[PDB]
Amino acid sequence: TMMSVLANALRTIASAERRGKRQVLIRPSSKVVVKFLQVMQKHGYIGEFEIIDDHRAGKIVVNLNGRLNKCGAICPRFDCATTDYEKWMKNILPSRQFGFVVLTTSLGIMDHEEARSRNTGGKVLGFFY
Amino acid sequence: TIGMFNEEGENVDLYIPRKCHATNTLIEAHDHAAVQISIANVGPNGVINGTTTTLCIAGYLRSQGESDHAINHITIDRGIMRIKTGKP
Amino acid sequence: MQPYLRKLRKLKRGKPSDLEESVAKALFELETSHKTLRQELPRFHVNTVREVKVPRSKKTVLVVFYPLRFLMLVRKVQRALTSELEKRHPGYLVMLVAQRKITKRPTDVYKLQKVQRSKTSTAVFENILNDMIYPSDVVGRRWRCRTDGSKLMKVFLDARDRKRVESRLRAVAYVYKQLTHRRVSFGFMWNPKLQQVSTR
Amino acid sequence: VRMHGNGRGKASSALPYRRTPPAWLKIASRNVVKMVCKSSRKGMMPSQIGMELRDSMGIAQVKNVTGRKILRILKHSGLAPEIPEDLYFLVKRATQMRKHLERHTTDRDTKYRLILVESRIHRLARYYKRVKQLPPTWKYES
Amino acid sequence: GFFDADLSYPTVRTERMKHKRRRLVQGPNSYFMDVSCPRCRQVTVVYSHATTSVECKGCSKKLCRPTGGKALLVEGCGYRRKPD
RNA sequence: CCUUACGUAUCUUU
RNA sequence: UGCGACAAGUGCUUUCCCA
RNA sequence: AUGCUGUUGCUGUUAAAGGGUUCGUAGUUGAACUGUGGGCUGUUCCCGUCCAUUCGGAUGACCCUGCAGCCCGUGAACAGAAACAACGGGAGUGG
Ligand SMILES: [Mg+2]
């Protein structure tokens, strides 16, 4: 059965982006997987996406613009202190220049760079670069 | 303004390379199937001008068979090739 | 104590507005002069009628709040009320929306479980939109999260009911922002089974 | 049937987005509750009431016409079954297999399928006892 | 050709072929129809996939027969599909 | 600038 | 208990019977 | 040194390795949903009327996050409703 819906969504984005597609259809969706995508919009790794309303869980159609190399999900959502950001950057990111680690914190779902500036910690969700 | 800089604002890298116009894939130096295609811009009397529209396609996209679908999708976007007939 | 004031809540029978009197006179008139309204209007009364000026004018919307007890009462008889109120009120476009309470989302995980799901802001706001366009139910719904960080909910309606509600949509989309403080945009679908958008 | 066996079959009914009665039916919500509660007095279980209203009365989805579901209408009226309908047809299947196996002592395949239905019975009855639709002492026959 | 597929707004040709749950928004295949009895003539509302055998409430006769898919109406009866 | 839709034969039949 | 106001997330000027 | 003990981080078709198949407890894992608001002020073508007949012609497009005040959904007020969450044996001799 499907266990993690966010890990499902990021795996279908990353698979269709290495195939060079123009759109993906993501099923099912959540509040978490749209808050992950809006982090990926703000740093322009994806384009506009659209949530279709069923009275079920929704579907998302994401427009890809060629910029994303890999997005993935860290499972389980390991707890990450503020001293631990430089440890997670060296492990899953290709460089310190680019690439983001998305965390779910008390302040919201943010990338690692914003959470370092607001002096907060959280559980790690995933990454995109 | 493309390529990495120095914190003194001098363009540090050699060779900012091309990118595929279909897949935004950075074309490498050994990708010997990667082609540029120059399409002549033509005037109102149907004779070519001195300007051409050049579009470059990566080598793996030609390898699969998907280049010809990509040249269509580009030239509709550039406005080079019409998408359908006019109404009769 | 005048008899048309039964069509109004008791808190406003002493000092009605100019619009609260004008609606209640017309709503009391509709017994002896209408057939289907005789069965359902003696029980009905409105809370307050609030008028809002749309920025693109020539039809100013007239929003009439009623108790949510009478929800199925009006639904049986709506599109006779809105047609006959807008007939007795020239140059006004009449909305009939029920008055619904919203419970603010609790911080506690235990209070969140006990929340009546009807008083949910997501559930209330989708019922307020259904009141503004009742014979045209919501065919589909989409949120476009465009790149600047904004969400816009698009509601699709059936394209078979375009002529009944086309002038009202610019009014509905504005009053929905006056009441809910959310932005909505409308479109139409021909063949809504197969998700086909109307395209003019 | 995915839980026991290798079947990946996907055959369901796909409910409409537009949850509204179709406006050509003039039956009241009050009368549908009378028809649902009447069929239960003729011995019909809730899955069988809804097809008879779907097929002949034109009431697809009793929930949309009368805002509550069929079994909820029955529980209000006092006409719920004593044990749930899921557990009824699995017990009624499991006793028909056992009455077969008493004269057919070497029906090797039906002894395997009987393990599977009783595994479904002990796994549903754990759900219904937890959710308190079933008494704690319930304890299937065999 | 020359028109690319848009996954949000698929073609009517593409979308009519799909399975009812494999649609972009899933939905029914069935419908209701207003069946007139062959004698007796009174209208009944019969579901298209009626697995039960519906009876004419006036005629007392059975004007439908279940199948593996759509149910088969009797000979000599008139029917028009109802909307929604 | 990503279509508001569409093409039907054969032979056995108390 | 009687009585004066105002509400009600589900119309009692209702709903069934019955004439 | 040894990602040759692998949480990071190993292998398991053929190199060592998926247990004959199902059910199944302890165990570990487990679908979506109730929400994060708003206001003001900054920051040349082509479409037709004359020519010509399996190939021509003169003749409606486009171009100009930042600070403050919010009954902070909407009702309802102009302290009341909405949403909210009594000890002197006291106080450097009762602030
Ligand atoms: Mg004190």
Side-chain angles (χ1 to χ4, degrees), chain A residues 1-47 49-78 80-129, chain B, chain C residues 1-14 16-19 22-34 36-75 77-78 80-85 87-103 105-107 110-159 161-163 165-182 184-199, chain D residues 1-81 83-138 140-142, chain E residues 1-3 5-74 76-84:
Chain A
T1 53
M2 188 171 298
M3 295 298 175
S4 181
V5 176
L6 179 57
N8 188 21
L10 299 176
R11 190 170 53 238
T12 61
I13 296 169
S15 297
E17 177 62 29
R18 70 188 291 156
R19 297 184 293 117
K21 302 302 288 186
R22 193 170 297 113
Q23 279 167 346
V24 310
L25 178 64
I26 291 164
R27 179 189 59 85
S29 70
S30 180
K31 294 183 292 186
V32 179
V33 319
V34 302
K35 284 183 176 292
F36 202 97
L37 288 175
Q38 290 176 356
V39 176
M40 299 174 67
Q41 275 192 348
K42 186 181 91 277
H43 311 288
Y45 282 87
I46 66 166
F49 61 95
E50 193 178 8
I51 294 101
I52 294 98
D53 184 66
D54 308 337
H55 299 297
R56 270 71 56 183
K59 297 178 178 183
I60 307 171
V61 178
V62 182
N63 292 108
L64 300 168
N65 57 1
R67 292 176 187 172
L68 187 69
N69 297 115
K70 175 175 280 188
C71 61
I74 293 97
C75 296
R77 297 174 183 177
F78 295 105
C80 177
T82 309
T83 60
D84 298 339
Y85 289 121
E86 188 65 33
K87 186 258 288 185
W88 281 102
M89 286 173 68
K90 70 176 287 188
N91 285 323
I92 60 175
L93 296 178
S95 73
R96 296 184 69 205
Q97 267 66 235
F98 67 97
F100 290 101
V101 179
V102 184
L103 289 88
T104 188
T105 70
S106 300
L107 299 167
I109 287 174
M110 301 184 293
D111 49 347
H112 78 281
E113 183 182 356
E114 177 174 358
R116 190 184 295 118
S117 72
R118 302 180 71 183
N119 195 7
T120 187
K123 293 175 183 291
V124 58
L125 292 181
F127 60 93
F128 61 94
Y129 52 85
Chain B
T1 308
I2 180 167
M4 71 179 72
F5 284 163
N6 208 170
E7 288 286 330
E8 287 86 8
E10 70 99 23
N11 197 359
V12 184
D13 58 354
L14 54 95
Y15 162 60
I16 297 98
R18 298 177 292 172
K19 292 187 287 186
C20 184
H21 283 288
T23 62
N24 205 172
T25 298
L26 198 70
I27 293 176
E28 281 178 347
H30 63 89
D31 193 66
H32 295 102
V35 299
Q36 279 185 355
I37 297 165
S38 297
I39 298 168
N41 288 317
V42 305
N45 54 356
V47 174
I48 61 170
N49 291 320
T51 55
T52 59
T53 297
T54 300
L55 55 95
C56 54
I57 304 300
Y60 68 98
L61 190 64
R62 296 180 70 244
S63 295
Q64 299 171 3
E66 300 293 324
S67 64
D68 179 69
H69 184 275
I71 311 299
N72 294 326
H73 186 274
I74 293 167
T75 56
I76 273 105
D77 289 334
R78 305 292 180 89
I80 301 169
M81 188 173 70
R82 285 188 292 115
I83 194 162
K84 67 178 182 178
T85 61
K87 79 279 195 185
Chain C
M1 184 59 207
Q2 289 172 348
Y4 61 87
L5 292 171
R6 293 198 292 267
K7 305 298 179 183
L8 198 61
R9 69 184 295 171
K10 299 173 187 175
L11 188 143
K12 294 184 179 293
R13 292 179 185 175
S17 178
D18 295 329
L19 287 170
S22 296
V23 172
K25 284 181 179 182
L27 199 65
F28 183 80
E29 178 68 26
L30 258 45
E31 277 80 358
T32 187
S33 69
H34 199 88
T36 63
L37 288 167
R38 275 179 289 112
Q39 286 84 21
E40 311 295 318
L41 282 180
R43 283 82 54 87
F44 183 68
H45 69 276
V46 298
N47 289 328
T48 182
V49 44
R50 179 258 183 92
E51 189 266 330
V52 50
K53 182 258 183 184
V54 290
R56 294 186 180 94
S57 297
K58 181 261 182 181
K59 285 177 182 178
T60 67
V61 270
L62 190 62
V63 177
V64 181
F65 290 96
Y66 59 88
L68 192 267
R69 298 183 302 282
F70 306 113
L71 185 64
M72 301 295 289
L73 177 69
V74 177
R75 299 301 202 185
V77 85
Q78 197 167 2
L81 281 174
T82 69
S83 297
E84 291 294 328
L85 285 173
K87 181 68 178 179
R88 275 99 171 103
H89 296 283
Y92 284 149
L93 200 150
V94 179
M95 302 293 178
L96 294 164
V97 295
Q99 186 69 253
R100 296 177 183 88
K101 185 75 176 176
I102 285 176
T103 295
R105 172 187 161 91
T107 60
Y110 305 107
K111 293 185 181 292
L112 177 63
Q113 292 168 351
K114 292 184 184 290
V115 168
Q116 184 176 2
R117 297 291 293 265
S118 304
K119 294 187 185 292
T120 277
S121 168
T122 306
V124 167
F125 287 163
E126 75 183 6
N127 290 131
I128 294 173
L129 186 62
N130 294 326
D131 285 327
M132 296 174 185
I133 34 100
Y134 173 66
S136 299
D137 53 352
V138 173
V139 143
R141 181 175 291 170
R142 284 168 190 256
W143 294 266
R144 290 183 66 251
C145 302
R146 68 187 193 274
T147 320
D148 57 3
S150 67
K151 297 179 74 178
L152 179 65
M153 184 177 76
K154 191 173 184 69
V155 169
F156 289 90
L157 296 180
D158 197 1
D161 289 333
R162 168 171 277 170
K163 271 76 179 174
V165 49
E166 187 70 27
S167 61
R168 301 172 69 90
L169 289 184
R170 188 183 295 277
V172 170
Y174 185 77
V175 179
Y176 181 81
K177 186 170 168 57
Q178 288 297 109
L179 298 179
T180 70
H181 300 288
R182 274 86 174 88
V184 72
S185 63
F186 291 101
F188 293 93
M189 282 185 178
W190 77 277
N191 197 7
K193 181 183 178 64
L194 271 61
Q195 292 288 312
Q196 296 301 111
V197 180
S198 179
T199 310
Chain D
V1 174
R2 176 87 280 278
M3 181 165 71
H4 294 158
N6 281 315
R8 281 86 189 272
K10 300 174 181 66
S12 295
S13 68
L15 285 178
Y17 185 83
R18 303 177 66 190
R19 296 194 300 255
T20 300
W24 48 255
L25 86 172
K26 272 78 68 179
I27 189 168
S29 166
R30 189 176 296 112
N31 289 318
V32 175
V33 177
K34 288 178 186 174
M35 299 187 76
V36 165
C37 292
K38 188 170 294 298
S39 299
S40 181
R41 295 187 194 276
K42 279 93 178 68
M44 291 157 60
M45 298 192 77
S47 183
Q48 186 63 41
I49 304 175
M51 304 180 200
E52 294 291 334
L53 269 65
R54 164 173 57 84
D55 297 335
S56 62
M57 293 303 294
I59 306 164
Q61 294 300 314
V62 174
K63 180 170 174 59
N64 293 126
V65 181
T66 69
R68 62 274 188 207
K69 297 180 179 72
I70 293 176
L71 183 65
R72 183 62 68 204
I73 289 165
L74 264 63
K75 288 180 183 175
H76 293 169
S77 182
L79 273 66
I83 65 170
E85 189 188 9
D86 309 335
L87 195 61
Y88 179 79
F89 284 102
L90 285 175
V91 168
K92 177 244 181 63
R93 178 178 293 118
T95 61
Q96 289 177 359
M97 293 184 186
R98 293 182 70 88
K99 192 180 181 297
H100 173 72
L101 288 172
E102 62 186 1
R103 59 177 67 246
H104 300 91
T105 55
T106 54
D107 195 356
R108 31 162 279 161
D109 195 7
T110 310
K111 280 193 252 76
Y112 175 70
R113 297 289 198 265
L114 182 69
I115 294 167
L116 266 55
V117 295
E118 289 173 347
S119 292
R120 285 199 283 270
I121 287 170
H122 297 303
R123 167 191 269 252
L124 275 179
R126 186 167 64 245
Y127 166 68
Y128 287 116
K129 286 188 286 185
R130 176 175 63 237
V131 84
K132 277 90 168 68
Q133 296 296 314
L134 200 66
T137 64
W138 188 69
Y140 170 69
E141 179 77 32
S142 299
Chain E
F2 282 169
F3 289 99
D6 194 356
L7 271 68
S8 300
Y9 300 101
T11 295
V12 64
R13 184 182 182 275
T14 300
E15 191 68 18
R16 73 169 67 253
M17 298 193 298
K18 285 182 177 293
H19 187 77
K20 70 183 182 183
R21 296 176 77 96
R22 261 68 176 175
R23 296 170 190 165
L24 186 62
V25 178
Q26 70 183 3
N29 278 323
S30 63
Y31 54 93
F32 292 94
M33 69 189 83
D34 204 3
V35 171
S36 67
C37 169
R39 55 188 181 181
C40 94
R41 55 195 71 254
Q42 184 176 8
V43 296
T44 312
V45 176
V46 181
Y47 185 72
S48 65
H49 292 276
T51 58
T52 64
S53 173
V54 310
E55 292 287 329
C56 179
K57 72 279 194 189
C59 331
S60 64
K61 75 176 293 185
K62 49 175 288 294
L63 42 84
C64 183
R65 194 177 72 188
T67 324
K70 291 189 179 178
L72 182 58
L73 305 178
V74 289
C77 72
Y79 64 99
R80 57 185 64 190
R81 176 172 179 171
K82 282 186 173 295
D84 277 317

